[PDB]
């Protein structure tokens, strides 16, 4: 006769990170589920990191497009750290177009309905001329884990045009997880615990949805021990 926890609340302490709470738990399941969920949530979550970039007037990722104060390579890193959410398809082609002195926020990307940018203060590159212009096509797709360019670069032989720069994917929303087990509060009974998870995030994945998908994964895995 055990008990079973629930999701007593999802305290949204900020735009990025929140604090889910589980209650109640038995003596020990606190640390058990805590560690299991931390390890899952860090490993396996669906992200939407950028995969391929194509600036219009650049051959390879080492030149300097005239008029913008950052190497194409540093522009490319600042893209690698982009954070975006897609719902319908598994891949989309965002488009950036900009001209004139001033920064280039991420919000300048066209806002196709199925795509939600999540941080319009994010800066790609600084333009530094009146009549200077950049325009790029950015391919963003689903994924899981970490997938370098050196792996995909051997994943298809059909020719790739000269000009498609390949960023490394970082398909992962969670950034930092912690948990504390502490004293619970239930019907006239002590020796029950409350697990308090705390998850940093790009902002893409809802906390409750994250914790629920992690639980689903782990139940799917245990569907193999329960039968031998």
């Amino acid at each position: 006769e055990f008990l079973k926890p629930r999701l007593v609340d999802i305290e949204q302490v900020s735009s990025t990170h929140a604090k889910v709470t589980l209650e109640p738990l038995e003596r020990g399941f606190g640390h058990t589920l805590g560690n299991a969920l931390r390890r899952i949530l860090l490993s396996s979550m669906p992200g939407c990191a950028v995969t391929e970039v194509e600036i219009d007037g650049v051959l390879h990722e080492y030149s300097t497009k005239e008029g913008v104060q950052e190497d194409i390579l540093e522009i490319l890193l600042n893209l690698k750290g982009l954070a975006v959410r897609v719902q319908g398809k598994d891949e989309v082609i965002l488009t950036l177009n900009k001209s004139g002195i001033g920064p280039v926020t991420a919000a300048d990307i066209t806002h196709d309905g199925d795509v939600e940018i999540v941080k319009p203060q994010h800066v790609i590159c600084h333009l530094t001329d009146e009549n200077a212009s950049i325009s790029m096509r950015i391919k963003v797709q689903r994924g899981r884990g970490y997938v370098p360019a050196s792996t995909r670069i051997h994943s298809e032989e059909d020719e790739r045009p000269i000009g498609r720069l390949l960023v490394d994917a970082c398909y992962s929303p969670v950034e930092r997880i912690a948990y504390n087990v502490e004293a619970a509060r239930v019907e006239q009974r002590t020796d029950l615990d409350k697990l308090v998870i705390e998850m940093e995030t790009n902002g893409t994945i809802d906390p409750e949805e994250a914790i629920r998908r992690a639980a689903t994964i782990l139940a799917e895995q245990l569907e193999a021990f329960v039968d031998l």
Partner: protein
């Protein structure tokens, strides 16, 4: 002076923290030393040596 600076921060005086093992999730015995050390790469690379 280092003790005084750490204590200006919210960090423990000894400079040693308790750490939790990533695998089993259970505490380490006997707090360990953490900090930020400035590390360097060296042009003796495996794909130039193999």
């Amino acid at each position: 002076e280092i003790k005084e600076l750490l204590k200006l921060g919210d960090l423990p005086t000894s400079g040693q923290i308790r750490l939790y093992d990533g695998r089993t999730g259970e505490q380490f015995e006997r707090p360990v030393t953490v900090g930020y050390m400035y590390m360097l790469k060296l042009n003796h690379l495996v794909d130039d040596k193999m």
